[PDB]
């Protein structure tokens, strides 16, 4: 009756249904080939504020059952094309970053931890998850990198991968079709550039309005409809309208 690690695949989501239909069969087959037990949670942001990838991931982490002993923060549009990218339980060193800057098609800087990042449950809890202050594109992953170093942890990446930035992942994301929300308002630039010791997993404010059970060509996926709250006295750049 051997125990096996189980991965909660946490997919930040808003208006990406076409991407989702490609994601689910691709990831299900890819993970089955390497024997990784897992479940996909689509973290569907249904408030009207700007997209907040990091807070959705905090909510996903809270919701997912304790049976999942590690999470994969996973963009819905970024699909691994190399079976040697192992989505395995991370070591004691810290998070396992699958979409490394030598492998990612777009981002190539040393401490990039975006795209696909696998974290043990206990490490994520020790770090108080991710900051809640990042509304709109950018920076939430870089702040989480500092959280990793501040916890005395390190990032590990796949070794001896022979593919490179052109052929390790498919990133089907056209910048005019899916526009990156890079607006700034109020003092967003100056506030989001600073390390956030005040927010995270323990104080993300939200309601899950509905949980949907979906099957896509027989593959079960959970949809969380997440209503994020924004405190405009703290982060008014949740809405630049
Ligand atoms: O309006 C949005 C913005 C982003 N995302 C999710 O957030 C991920 C990261 O965003 P993006 O693709 O814009 O980042 P980049 O391609 O710059 O890494 C996407 O793949 C989606 O999973 C989404 O679902 N809706
Ligand atoms: Mn993308």
CATH code for position 151 = 3.90.550.10
- From 195, 94, 99, select the one nearest 139 (Cα to Cα): 195
Structure determined via: X-ray
> Which residues are 118's β-sheet partners?
72, 96
* Cα separation values, 236 from 135, 140, 184, 239, Å: 9, 17, 10, 6
* Closest by Cα among 63, 99, 110, 21 to 209: 63
Closest residue CA from atom 8 of ligand 1: 75
Q: Is 148 helix (H, G, I), strand (E, B) or coil?
A: helix
Count the domains in the chain: 1
Between the CA of 141 and the centroid of ligand 1 the distance, in Å, is: 12
**Residue 31: what are its φ and ψ, rounded to 5°?**
-70, -35
Where is 189: in which H helix or E strand?
helix 188-192
Rounded distance between C-alpha atoms, residue 70 and residue 88, angstroms: 9
Resolution value in angstroms: 1.8
Is 120 annotated as a binding-site member?
A: no
Domain range spanning residue 25?
Answer: 1-241
Distance 4 CA to ligand 2 centre (A): 31
- CA–CA dist 233, 142 (Å, integer): 24
């Amino acid at each position: 009756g051997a125990s096996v690690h189980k991965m909660a695949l946490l997919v930040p989501f808003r208006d990406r249904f076409e991407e989702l239909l490609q994601f689910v069969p691709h990831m299900t087959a890819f993970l089955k080939r390497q024997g990784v037990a897992h479940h996909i949670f689509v973290l569907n942001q249904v408030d009207r504020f700007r997209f907040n990838r990091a807070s959705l991931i905090n909510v996903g982490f809270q919701f997912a059952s304790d049976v999942y002993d590690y999470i994969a923060m996973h963009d819905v549009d970024l699909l691994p094309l190399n079976d040697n990218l192992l989505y395995e339980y991370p070591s004691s060193l810290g998070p396992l970053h699958i979409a490394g800057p030598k492998l990612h098609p777009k981002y190539h800087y040393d401490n990039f931890v975006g795209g696909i990042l696998l974290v043990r449950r206990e490490h994520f809890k020790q770090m108080n998850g991710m900051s809640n202050q990042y509304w709109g594109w950018g920076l939430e992953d870089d702040e989480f990198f500092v959280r990793i170093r501040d916890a005395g942890l390190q990032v590990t990446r796949p070794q001896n991968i022979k593919t490179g930035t052109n052929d390790t992942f498919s990133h089907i994301h056209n910048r005019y079709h899916r526009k990156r929300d890079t607006q700034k308002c109020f003092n967003q630039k100056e506030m989001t550039r600073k390390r956030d010791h005040k927010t995270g997993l323990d104080n993300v404010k939200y309601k899950i309005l509905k949980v949907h059970e979906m099957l896509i060509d027989q593959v079960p996926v959970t949809i969380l409809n997440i209503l994020l709250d924004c405190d405009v006295n703290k982060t008014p750049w949740c809405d630049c309208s």
